[PDB]
Amino acid sequence: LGLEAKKEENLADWYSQVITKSEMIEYHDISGCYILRPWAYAIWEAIKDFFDAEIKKLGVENCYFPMFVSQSALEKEKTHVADFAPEVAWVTRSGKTELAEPIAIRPTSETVMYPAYAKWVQSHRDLPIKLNQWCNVVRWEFKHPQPFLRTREFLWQEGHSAFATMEEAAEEVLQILDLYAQVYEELLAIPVVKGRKTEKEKFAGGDYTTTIEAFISASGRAIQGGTSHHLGQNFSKMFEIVFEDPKIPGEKQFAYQNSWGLTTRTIGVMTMVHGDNMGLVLPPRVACVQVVIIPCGITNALSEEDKEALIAKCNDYRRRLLSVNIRVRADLRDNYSPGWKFNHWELKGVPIRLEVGPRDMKSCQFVAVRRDTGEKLTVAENEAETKLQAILEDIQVTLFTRASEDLKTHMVVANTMEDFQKILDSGKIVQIPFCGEIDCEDWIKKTTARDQDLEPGAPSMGAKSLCIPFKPLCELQPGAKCVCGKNPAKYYTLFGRSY
Amino acid sequence: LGLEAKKEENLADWYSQVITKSEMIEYHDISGCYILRPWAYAIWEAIKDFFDAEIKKLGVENCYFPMFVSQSALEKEKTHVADFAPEVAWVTRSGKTELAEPIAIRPTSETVMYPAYAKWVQSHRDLPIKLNQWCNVVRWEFKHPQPFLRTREFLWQEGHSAFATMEEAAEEVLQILDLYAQVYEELLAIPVVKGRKTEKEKFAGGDYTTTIEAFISASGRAIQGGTSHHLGQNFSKMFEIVFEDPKIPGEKQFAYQNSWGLTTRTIGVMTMVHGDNMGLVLPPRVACVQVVIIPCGITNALSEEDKEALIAKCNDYRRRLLSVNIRVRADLRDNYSPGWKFNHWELKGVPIRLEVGPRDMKSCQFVAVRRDTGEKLTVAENEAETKLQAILEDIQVTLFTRASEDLKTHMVVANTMEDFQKILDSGKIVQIPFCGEIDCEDWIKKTTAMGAKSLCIPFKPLCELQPGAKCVCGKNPAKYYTLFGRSY
Ligand SMILES: Cc1cc(N2CC[C@@](CO)(C3CC3)C2=O)cc(C(=O)NCc2cc(F)cc(-c3cnn(C)c3)c2)n1
Ligand SMILES: Cc1cc(N2CC[C@@](CO)(C3CC3)C2=O)cc(C(=O)NCc2cc(F)cc(-c3cnn(C)c3)c2)n1
Ligand code: PRO
Ligand code: PRO
Ligand SMILES: [Ca+2]
Ligand SMILES: [Ca+2]
Ligand SMILES: [Ca+2]
Ligand SMILES: [Ca+2]
Ligand SMILES: [Ca+2]
Ligand SMILES: [Ca+2]
Ligand SMILES: [Ca+2]
Ligand SMILES: [Ca+2]
Ligand SMILES: [Ca+2]
Ligand SMILES: [Ca+2]
Ligand SMILES: [Cl-]
Ligand SMILES: [Cl-]
Ligand SMILES: [Cl-]
Ligand SMILES: [Zn+2]
Ligand SMILES: [Zn+2]
């Protein structure tokens, strides 16, 4: 029948079973390449529709840049290329014919886009430039891939803005990060922690990186859900993105830049956070189908005239819901049982199942079964639009509240290395006082791996920084020491085992 | 102060200046690849809106398949692979590490998708499968690229359907071809000829190819606008897309498949067809901005009272046009002159410019300027909504009528090789009685020389083939009238 893999036993096999039986993912014959079937792609589209509308309000415009980079352009920002070079895929021939020059597939589009920005900017009035594109990128790592979360090819949005002043750029970084938090929290019903990446973890070639971190309670691990960088002038100086202002005559000034990105990793996090042992669970805000209508109790005995009346009543509900902007499907096919339909649509995580039997049809009522809790309700026909809308809104709230509770009990403060170690081995993420230096972050990773006390099902790995929270749980006492002991702490920092 | 190159002189240079000064295209530092700036991308989004909605009504669903394909999957259909192999780009290393096996970038996704289709079809009840994707493909030809029309990488949509019976597949082929004709004719105001590709020109690995053909009179050359193929069973026998017959126990049947594609070549044809010596000209149906509002007559003389009232009048036209679902921009920027704006939006082909100066505000009226004809109209204020919509519709009709006249002018019939050659070097396309044989089509190309090629066998030819006509080669009897011409 349905799912038989259990989430609290083997998470990896549960994850693979859920994403395939929900018809979200299919495996491609190339490792780390995954097919996004319609049930998953529609979630990406719901994300796209929301985010596109929001950034359009900010003045951002969509466009499409080439997928290839020249070796010359790829290497102009040395920090950036040093970080990305081992995983850049190279095209070297066409047919059997060697190319003029090997060309790179974009791992990210800074080095594709910024020679164009340098052309388009001549005067102070050519700024700001605010472009976004929905496209695929390729990061050809040889580590083990995981669908949605960590893949060699993925779909994303990347935004790239260039400003005359640091004030404007700084403002945008946080506006975009707020939108990413809205994607996770309002659409996907996933709570996130906003923060700044440490020096170790920031975008190579950027000034600073801001992030949203989500928590996967089944793992005890956290994952970076989205990212908003201030690149400063590090790319404009290397690509000659210069203007002249009459206020500062003669001197050429370098543009201040941001880039920001969000991928289909979103869909994996929603799968990990909300899925259960019956399969996927979709937040109503992104569900391709919010209500599935299924005609029940049909036997051989049912009169043919009665049967037609039943299929017509199911289509009645469908049209009523379509007219109130509820996304809806009537699973009317003859070639599957009611039980098989119940199971099929539960695996796919449809928020509400609408059951219509001949008895309920004739009594002008129906049954609504919520997916998150399995609770059932008998509803009078005349109320369908009203109550279904409310159940949808309650489902969204409930999913978020549950996930918020988990976050609140798995994120705590510790003020010493020993307490940090212990709390971390209990499967939580921890805010600790931290010196910020890259070397101390390496030492933290090394020794929390070394000193790990293994709880039965837990991952065996060192702790990494996640973000410096904008709003820590507590305020740093004056003169507090980092967990390293030898440097004063600069801020509370969230640390955990992570993806 | 705008366009200097003339369309009737060096067309290629006109095209280059129009697509750059309308801020549609930028050159990338890799030869032959182009940046789609927002002005162009927004047209592609309009096309996508229409077409996405329509194919959703047909039961088609969007997905995303990998961009990479393995050697073994690529060569399973021999005809298809042979035709695409010289233009397939190959990834051979990541960083410095040579890859174990080179992997290919998709030129088209039949060989990416159809292994999965074979997994998904378990039974008659798993059909039909109807999938579409909006994505990029690479066809690395070493010939001279041309923005929009012929490019090494381009955005498209590719739809791929598998059915249990040929009757279903055949129906869908024509429904999609009709939607492509609607994109060109209702959205882009470009007339097209529907037809079938000759044996020579049909999609490699398919049984037949339906197409829409457009005509660029500045060139005398035709261009293939969009195509819908019936792949028959050629691919399902190679990739084992099978289901058991519901009535004959044990007998496996091979699914009947179609595929159909439409690319950003659309935008290029729109530019070549409607553009003039002032620049781009947008059909209102796909125009990002349908009406641009431009304040005029601001001087240092004008009082702050008067300037702020003028700006507010502009914003009230903005609100009222947004209210009636006219896509409007108010260009209220102070650091650009009104002349600069007139030029900027003319080059970008905005259908209507709405000028408001102080005296016009004080006369409760404004000036509307149609981009296509250059005609200025004075419009009372209270009529803004209804008049502007009228003009927008008239613009769309006018662009389509002119272009339609052009095609009627440049597509004529001929029944000999002599007049075929005369009318062809006339800069026109000719329907001629044709035998359909490949050797004779090679021959027509060799004789006509740039040689003419076949374009389509029109669904609705201009004349009925009169009983027993012979083909222009002379050796054989004709089988159908066939559209021929020089081609992009
Ligand atoms: C889907 C996706 C999203 C993001 N990121 C990063 C940026 C961010 C942050 O939010 C968003 C754009 C801004 C995001 O989503 C990063 C990757 C990725 O690095 N892919 C390559 C790869 C392939 C592979 F086979 C294995 C591994 C791998 C890595 N460790 N292990 C143990 C295996 C990595 N992939
Ligand atoms: C944008 C686009 C659209 C279509 N197609 C074809 C199919 C169709 C029509 O319906 C749609 C998919 C269904 C369409 O739009 C085909 C190409 C293309 O073959 N590109 C490769 C290339 C690169 C290059 F640098 C030069 C040349 C080249 C070829 N001759 N010359 C004189 C130069 C070719 N490109
Ligand atoms: O890869 C990154 O993280 C940045 C954000 C999107 C574009 N590049
Ligand atoms: O390239 C072509 O012509 C067909 C139709 C789109 C997918 N393959
Ligand atoms: Ca769907
Ligand atoms: Ca690094
Ligand atoms: Ca790296
Ligand atoms: Ca990291
Ligand atoms: Ca130090
Ligand atoms: Ca223990
Ligand atoms: Ca635009
Ligand atoms: Ca070829
Ligand atoms: Ca047999
Ligand atoms: Ca047989
Ligand atoms: Cl299972
Ligand atoms: Cl080359
Ligand atoms: Cl736990
Ligand atoms: Zn420290
Ligand atoms: Zn002949």
Residue numbers in the entry:
A (entry chain A): 1014 to 1512
B (entry chain B): 1014 to 1462, 1474 to 1512
Could you share sentences copied from the article?
Aminoacyl-tRNA synthetases (aaRSs) are an essential enzyme family for protein translation and, in several cases, have been validated drug targets. Among the aaRSs, prolyl-tRNA synthetase (PRS) is a validated drug target in Plasmodial spp and Toxoplasma gondii (Tg). In the current study, we examined five ATP-mimetics L95, L96, L97, L35, and L36, based on the 1-(pyridin-4-yl) pyrrolidin-2-one (PPL) scaffold. We successfully co-crystallized all five compounds with TgPRS (L95, L96, L97, L35, and L36) and three with HsPRS (L95, L96, and L97), all in complex with L-pro.
